[PDB]
Amino acid sequence: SLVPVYIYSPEYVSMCDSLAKIPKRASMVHSLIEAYALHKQMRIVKPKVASMEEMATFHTDAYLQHLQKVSQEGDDHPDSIEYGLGYDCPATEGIFDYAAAIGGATITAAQCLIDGMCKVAINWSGGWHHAKKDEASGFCYLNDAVLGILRLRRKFERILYVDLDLHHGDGVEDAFSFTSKVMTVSLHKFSPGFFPGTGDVSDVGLGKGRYYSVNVPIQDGIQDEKYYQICESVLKEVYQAFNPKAVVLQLGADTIAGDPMCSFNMTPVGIGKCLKYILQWQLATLILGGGGYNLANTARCWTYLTGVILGKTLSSEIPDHEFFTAYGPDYVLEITPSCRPDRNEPHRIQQILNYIKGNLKHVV
Numbered sequence: 001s002l003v004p005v006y007i008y009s010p011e012y013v014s015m016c017d018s019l020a021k022i023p024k025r026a027s028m029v030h031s032l033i034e035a036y037a038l039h040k041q042m043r044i045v046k047p048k049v050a051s052m053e054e055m056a057t058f059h060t061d062a063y064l065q066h067l068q069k070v071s072q073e074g075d076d077h078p079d080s081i082e083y084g085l086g087y088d089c090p091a092t093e094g095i096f097d098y099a100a101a102i103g104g105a106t107i108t109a110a111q112c113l114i115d116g117m118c119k120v121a122i123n124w125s126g127g128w129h130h131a132k133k134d135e136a137s138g139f140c141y142l143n144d145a146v147l148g149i150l151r152l153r154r155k156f157e158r159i160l161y162v163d164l165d166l167h168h169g170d171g172v173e174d175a176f177s178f179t180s181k182v183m184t185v186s187l188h189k190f191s192p193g194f195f196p197g198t199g200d201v202s203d204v205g206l207g208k209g210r211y212y213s214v215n216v217p218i219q220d221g222i223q224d225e226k227y228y229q230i231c232e233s234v235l236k237e238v239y240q241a242f243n244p245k246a247v248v249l250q251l252g253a254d255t256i257a258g259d260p261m262c263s264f265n266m267t268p269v270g271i272g273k274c275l276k277y278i279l280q281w282q283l284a285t286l287i288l289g290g291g292g293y294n295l296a297n298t299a300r301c302w303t304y305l306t307g308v309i310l311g312k313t314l315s316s317e318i319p320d321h322e323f324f325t326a327y328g329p330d331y332v333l334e335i336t337p338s339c340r341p342d343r344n345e346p347h348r349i350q351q352i353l354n355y356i357k358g359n360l361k362h363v364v
């Protein structure tokens with residue numbers, strides 16, 4: 001029960017890379033982790049494929065059946081737009097098998113936590129937080145985070161979902177916005193015209209779930225210190241108010257300097273501090289990836305974070321391995337922040353934190 005579970009198989013990695021949208025990302029992430037020999041220090045668990053019934057715990061039968069149908073051949077289906085397919089989510093080959101593989105991997109991790117096999121279980125290929133019950137959205141065919149949380153609900157009465165991806169985790173928040181059993185906390189860029197457009201600090205959930213959604217809207221250019229100060233302030237209060245029994249943590253690396261999104265200016269060290277703070281609660285914790293469009297930097301980030309989970313210090317030099325040539329121009333693990341300004345006004349941040357502190361008092 002001591003060592004983290006690492007969700008992995010060569011078949012799963014090949015499947016995760018098989019669509020080539022973020023080409024070879026899963027292989028690069030695993031290969032760097034392997035290059036640093038971190039997998040030796042972890043319990044490698046082969047993921048299972050999600051069954052129809054498991055996927056149906058969140059997604060509608062109509063959506064799953066459509067996804068399954070357009071997956072048989074290539075397939076332009078008249079119903080595809082209704083289901084969010086055709087643009088960011090093309091209806092490709094075994095798209096359904098891809099979705100079920102990713103959904104299954106996160107469920108497997110969750111089941112490992114339930115069975116007490118580990119206290120931390122990692123699926124770096126999961127974290128597809130935008131998908132809705134009946135619609136693909138924002139590159140997400142299926143919401144594995146929701147599927148993971150719903151699996152955890154078999155055992156845990158209160159689950160905290162923390163989303164540190166650059167984007168608002170609207171899909172997970174919406175799934176649980178009416179219930180107090182799951183609190184969702186998203187730190188994200190929030191700006192008119194920036195996807196997905198939701199998640200202002202006034203977004204607090206609905207009905208019985210009111211005040212169980214927490215949103216921290218942040219502006220371009222935030223760096224490690226300020227981000228950690230915000231994240232720690234919110235998590236300290238969320239922990240006190242909500243007393244979570246299990247945590248699902250999404251760590252999308254599109255906040256990291258050098259990402260094409262070019263919005264936040266974080267390094268993996270700052271995200272690592274937030275992760276450290278969550279790890280100290282010593283709860284069952286399900287670790288997911290997410291966005292991250294600079295491949296080398298994303299691998300850098302999730303590898304570093306795996307080190308944080310294992311309590312290891314990694315060498316600064318990127319080890320010789322399959323993708324060593326992608327790590328230019330410095331070929332080191334550290335990431336240097338970009339020279340552009342932090343657009344966050346300290347008093348605006350403080351007002352947001354106060355508003356959140358106020359909301360969390362209602363949590364009972």
Ligand SMILES: O=C(NO)c1ccc(-c2cccc3ccccc23)cc1
Nearest residue numbers: 088138139165167195252290291292
């Ligand atoms: O990593 C991401 N989230 O975690 C992500 C990145 C970019 C976009 C995204 C941004 C803007 C417009 C879009 C229009 C259609 C589909 C996706 C869009 C959506 C999500």
Ligand SMILES: [K+]
Nearest residue numbers: 163165187188
């Ligand atoms: K987020």
Ligand SMILES: [Zn+2]
Nearest residue numbers: 165166167291
């Ligand atoms: Zn994102």
